[PDB]
From a paper:
[name] is an anti-[name] (Acr) protein that inhibits Staphylococcus aureus [name] (SaCas9). The [name] protein, consisting of 170 amino acids, is comprised of two domains: an N-terminal domain (NTD) from residues 1 to 56, which contains a HTH motif resembling a transcriptional repressor, and a C-terminal domain (CTD) from residues 57 to 170. [name], by combining the HTH domain and [name] inhibitory domain within a single protein, exhibits dual functionality as a bi-functional anti-[name] protein capable of both transcriptional repression and [name]-based cleavage inhibition. Our structural and biochemical studies demonstrate that [name] functions as a dimer to simultaneously inhibit both anti-[name] operon transcription and SaCas9-sgRNA DNA recognition.
The bending of dsDNA upon binding to [name] prompted us to investigate whether [name] undergoes conformational changes upon binding promoter DNA. To address this question, we obtained the crystal structure of free [name] at a resolution of 2.34 Å. We find that full-length [name] exists as a dimer, similar to how it binds to DNA. Notably, the NTDs and the CTDs within the dimer share similar structures to what we observed in the DNA-bound and [name]-bound structures, respectively. However, due to the different relative positions of the CTD and NTD structural domains in the two monomers, the structures of the two monomers in the same dimer are different. Structural superposition of the [name] structures in the free and DNA-bound states showed that they have similar structures, suggesting that DNA binding does not induce significant structural rearrangement in [name]. The crystal structure and biochemical assays in solution reveal that the full-length [name] adopts a dimeric form, while its CTD alone remains as a monomer in solution. The main dimer interface is formed by the loop connecting helices 3 and 4 within the HTH domain, which involves multiple hydrogen bonds and hydrophobic interactions. A hydrophobic core is composed of specific amino acids, namely L44, I5, L8, L9, L32, L39, L42, and L50, from both monomers. Additionally, helix α1 contributes to dimer formation, with residue R2 from one monomer establishing hydrogen bonds with the sidechains of N45 and E48 from the opposite monomer.
Author numbering:
A (entry chain D), B (entry chain B): 0 to 170
């Protein structure tokens, strides 16, 4: 855990008790670090990591995502929000349901992520048609969708929502 | 220090006395770490740093980082490389420019690292809008970004590049 980051935490206006509660390091240690009775280099690696990780979180850039979707006819508009693409997807389905995005988009994304073949699953605009292979695939061990895959769930979709915009802010 | 690097040193074939003469760390401590008498967490920050800095210099020549960035266009992907995360960023900006990563991500990360409140800088999806206060901060005395911050500039970006992969030799 780098000393310069721990020093930024120790020279901060936070109370020694508040640092202790939030990090799990004793107030006694924090106080001795702040008054010079204990040198920072004398901290154990575990406690140094706890202080370093808390200060990194205090300096972490935040992310907020606003999704805007439009139908090809531009009659209907959709808006979903969240700090990750999964939360945006969850907000979208909570607001508009699970039948607005392309059919089986979640499963199709899983198949694409695992190296599977679209021809084998009879993928169609209506949806995956070969259900028996898909049920066997669920029994098969596979890698779960990552956060980026939830963004692709919107972008791979064209049946009802054709226009997809993701506005990101770090404020 | 970083555990992973120190764990490489202890596990890799070397003499505890040769480690002692090269690093200055007591042979008793190196032996106790290897035999499980001393846990790496209980090692003081001073000794952990001396062990880490040694292994780092012995791996500096062989250390390479490859970054891969995914976008909505499957055909369009970004590659950057370097011995440090900062070098990876410099290769990325030389090859692709400064308008691919999220707006003003470098400056926003710098502001956050220095404890600045983004409200004062009028941050939104367009980036920093209050250029006057940014000019004051640039002319102020501030802490520069450290190496891990450059990995974060890619990791926190989600507008154009939303999936980030780092391949590190760690040797």
């Amino acid at each position: 855990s780098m000393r310069k980051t721990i020093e930024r935490l120790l020279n901060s206006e936070l109370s020694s008790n508040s640092i202790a509660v939030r990090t799990g390091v004793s107030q006694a240690v924090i106080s001795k670090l702040r008054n010079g009775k204990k040198e920072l280099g004398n901290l154990t690696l575990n406690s140094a990591e706890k202080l370093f990780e808390y200060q990194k979180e205090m300096e972490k850039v935040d992310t907020w995502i606003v999704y805007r979707g439009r139908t090809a006819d531009m009659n209907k508009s959709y808006i979903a929000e969240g700090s990750t693409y999964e939360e945006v997807y969850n907000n979208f389905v909570d607001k508009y349901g699970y039948d607005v995005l392309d059919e089986d988009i979640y499963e199709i994304q899983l198949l694409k992520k695992n190296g599977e073949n679209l021809d084998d699953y009879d993928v169609d605009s209506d949806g995956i048609n070969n259900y028996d292979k898909l049920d066997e695939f669920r029994e098969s061990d596979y890698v779960d969708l990552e956060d980026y895959d939830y963004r692709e769930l919107f972008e791979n979709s064209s049946s009802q929502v054709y226009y997809h915009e993701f506005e990101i802010t770090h404020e």
